Amino acid sequence: HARYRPLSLRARQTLSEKSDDLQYHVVTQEWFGERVDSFLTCHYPQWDYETIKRLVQQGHIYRYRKNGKKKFTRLTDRLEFDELLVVPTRAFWEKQLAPPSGVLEETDGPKFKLSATAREMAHNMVLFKNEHVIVINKPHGLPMMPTDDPQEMSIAAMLPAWKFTNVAKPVVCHNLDRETSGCVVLARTRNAHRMLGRMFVKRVVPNSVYWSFCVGKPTVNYGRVRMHFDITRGNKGDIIVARPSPTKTSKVAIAEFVVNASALEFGSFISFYPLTTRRHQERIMAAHALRCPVLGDAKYGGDAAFPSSLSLFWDPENKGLPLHLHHRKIQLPYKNTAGEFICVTAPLPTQMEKTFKKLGWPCEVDDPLIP
Amino acid sequence: PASRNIVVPDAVHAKVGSPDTLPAEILQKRAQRALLMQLQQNVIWEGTVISDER
């Protein structure tokens, strides 16, 4: 909810101590030795153990031992005689600036019906599935989140389709562009989502690859690309200023590009291994840092991503050419029976398969750079 | 030679609404919009009326 401001540690402590919306449960003879978690579970049936643990471990719920200081306790610590246990209230969470933990609130929303054809499409889309995670081959044209036009299809909309024998639908762990296809990961459970979210933040060891067909050939076969973006809002779209040097408000974008095989100076096949997440880092780096736009990228390589070189295969005047960028070989923490991590791949889309076949290069090949 | 002026007739200039004159981004966006609408028609989506044929 709104009216929640970012608070430093001192500000949070000051607000917590000043607020009068606190309930003090006395520890009597009957609840002396009872554990904190059991006491809270008994006294707050409406709350969930997740909320209990979050509050206790983040300090929103504490105890006062008459010691002149508020002790912050673990869930496994025993209580004591004639001591207070301070717990906030709905008033504490709402009528002030301190935001609550993202569980205790009772927010809810409606549902949405899906057609049998859509469910079958989702089932065919699914690639890998276990008790924790799903990896699906998101197509080219479909978007991930709802578009500026509410009446449009989306992966978020289709999410309930692959709610296999689970009460709650999975949650997307990361998002792809509306023009890029390939693997996308869904966490089945909330704990799985929290654990797997640490993969998609900025990292130094690549775990996924992007196969791209780029017009032109970079001067070097393998290398690293680093660009600092200063995304800002514009009239309708957003401006993306890219610079080589850092800046206070800029965000870095790092990738490792390997030219798997280049036909000639006209076209090339590149693999991008990103160490960072930014709006359109792969496309921007291919277009500017490498000076080799993707074969279907009109947003950056306008009139240059559609070359007359491949007039025999693709019509240069057909601006609807799908982007020749494909997410592939996402590596997951979960291992297999052989002891090695699970690397889920996605088959190349129709256009990239056609281009590879026409150039004579094989399509189904294992990328050793992502073990 | 250089001093001589040359007048270019408007005929050679491409039409304003021509795809050549239009930036490639607009053409790609329109093509992708058409593809998305075709996909929505192919798989029954909510609020999608089948007013077409085939």
From chain A, pick out residues whose CB is under 8 angstroms from the CB of B41: none
Query: According to the entry, how was the structure determined?
Result: cryo-EM
From chain A, pick out residues whose CB is under 8 angstroms from the CB of B47: 151
DSSP 3-state of A211: strand
**Alpha-carbon span A239 to A297, nearest angstrom:** 17
Which residues are CB-contacts of B54 (< 8 A; sequence separation ≥ 6)?
none
How far away is chain A from the Cα of B38, in angstroms, using its nearest Cα? 11
Whether A293 and A266 have beta carbons less than 8 Å apart is answered as: no
* CA-based nearest residue in chain B for residue A117: B43
How far away is chain B from the Cα of A129, in angstroms, using its nearest Cα? 24
DSSP 3-state of A260: strand
From chain A, pick out residues whose CB is under 8 angstroms from the CB of B46: 112-113
Which residues lie across from A226 on neighbouring strands? A254
Q: How far is CA A226 from CA A28, A198, A217, A355, in A?
A: 62, 22, 18, 29
**Alpha-carbon span A103 to A190, nearest angstrom:** 11
**Alpha-carbon span A193 to A159, nearest angstrom:** 14
Phi, psi dihedral angles at B49 (to 5 degrees):
-95, 130
- Size (chain A), residues: 371
Resolution of the experimental structure, in angstroms: 3.5
Q: Which of B26, B29, B32, B49 to mutate to test the interface with A (most CBs of A within 10 A)?
A: B32
Q: Which of A113, A124, A153, A280 to mutate to test the interface with B (most CBs of B within 10 A)?
A: A153
How far away is chain A from the Cα of B40, in angstroms, using its nearest Cα? 7
State the residue for tokens 């479909």: A142
CB pair distance less than 8 Å for A303 and B46: no
- Size (chain B), residues: 54
